[PDB]
Amino acid sequence: GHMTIARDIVLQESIGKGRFGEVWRGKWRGEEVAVKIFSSREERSWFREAEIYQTVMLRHENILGFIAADNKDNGTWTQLWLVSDYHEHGSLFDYLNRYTVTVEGMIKLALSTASGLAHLHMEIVGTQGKPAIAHRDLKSKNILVKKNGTCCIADLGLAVRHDSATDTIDIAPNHRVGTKRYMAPEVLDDSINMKHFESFKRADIYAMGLVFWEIARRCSIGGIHEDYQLPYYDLVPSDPSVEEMRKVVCEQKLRPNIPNRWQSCEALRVMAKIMRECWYANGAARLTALRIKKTLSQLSQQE
Numbered sequence: 001g002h003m004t005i006a007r008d009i010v011l012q013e014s015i016g017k018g019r020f021g022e023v024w025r026g027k028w029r030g031e032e033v034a035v036k037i038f039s040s041r042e043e044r045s046w047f048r049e050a051e052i053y054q055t056v057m058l059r060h061e062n063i064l065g066f067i068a069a070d071n072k073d074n075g076t077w078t079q080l081w082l083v084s085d086y087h088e089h090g091s092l093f094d095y096l097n098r099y100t101v102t103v104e105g106m107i108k109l110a111l112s113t114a115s116g117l118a119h120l121h122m123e124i125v126g127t128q129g130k131p132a133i134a135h136r137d138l139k140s141k142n143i144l145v146k147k148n149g150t151c152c153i154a155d156l157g158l159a160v161r162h163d164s165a166t167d168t169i170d171i172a173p174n175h176r177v178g179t180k181r182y183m184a185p186e187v188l189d190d191s192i193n194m195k196h197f198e199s200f201k202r203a204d205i206y207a208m209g210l211v212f213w214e215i216a217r218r219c220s221i222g223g224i225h226e227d228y229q230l231p232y233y234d235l236v237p238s239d240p241s242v243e244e245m246r247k248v249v250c251e252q253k254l255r256p257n258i259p260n261r262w263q264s265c266e267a268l269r270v271m272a273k274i275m276r277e278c279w280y281a282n283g284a285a286r287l288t289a290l291r292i293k294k295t296l297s298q299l300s301q302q303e
């Protein structure tokens with residue numbers, strides 16, 4: 001018909017892997033689409049992600065464009081599919097490893113990321129209402145870069161949805177679910193109050209600050225920039241454990257280093273201030289995604 005379905009999609013190239021889903025580039029009626037494939041035993045993970053993407057009023061230019069959840073029986077086994085818009089640049093992690101950005105480029109990446117997060121976090125009240133949503137796994141590998149240089153947040157499988165009226169979360173959340181390197185202090189030491197939904201929003205803010213630090217490093221001014229690094233590259237091993245992260249972040253109370261050259265540029269100074277204000281140990285002290293978006297909107301306007 002006219003709706004995009006799995007039977008009309010031909011896979012072309014392996015392009016990645018999530019926690020469970022295997023990612024492919026595919027072709028649907030001439031057009032490129034991204035496909036995330038789960039096996040029958042990973043039905044809960046596939047279903048949960050499909051459930052979050054189908055939330056009423058979720059679509060936003062800074063959230064990955066969802067196309068469909070479908071099944072495909074090849075005649076031996078059934079594959080569980082998630083289909084989305086395809087972005088040639090891939091993740092913000094890949095983009096930042098390949099390129100440096102201008103001051104304008106940096107602001108576009110940070111603002112679009114802050115806008116997508118503010119949209120997820122915001123309850124939209126109305127007949128076609130949207131619950132507040134916390135991501136729980138924000139990181140540069142979970143954000144995609146569009147051709148126009150703006151970001152879109154993806155991999156919503158670990159998200160939590162909140163109903164403000166009855167004050168309830170739609171799932172019984174497990175502790176320490178995301179990427180250990182990006183885990184907020186209160187997640188690392190398990191002090192997070194998981195009966196308060198605002199704690200999950202606050203934990204996403206800390207991770208966004210880490211992502212902002214990744215972008216800023218790549219901001220080239222007069223051909224001067226830092227090389228690409230993951231947050232805490234200088235303090236923890238590759239594939240760090242919760243204990244290794246906890247000793248640095250909670251006990252030693254270290255955060256990614258803010259270079260001296262970031263104080264020489266107004267946009268870099270604004271970014272450095274946002275980062276520090278995302279990195280307080282206590283979530284209640286952190287900036288909101290809405291406030292960060294407002295700050296970066298004024299800065300993109302000022303140029």
Ligand SMILES: COc1ccc(-c2c(-c3ccnc(NC(C)=O)c3)[nH]c3cccnc23)cn1
Nearest residue numbers: 015016017018034036082083084086087088090
């Ligand atoms: C809801 O459906 C989907 C479909 C695909 C992805 C997805 C993509 C993805 C998306 C768009 N474009 C690309 N493009 C290039 C160049 O890789 C890659 N990369 C991933 C890595 C790990 C987990 N999921 C993904 C996420 N959700």
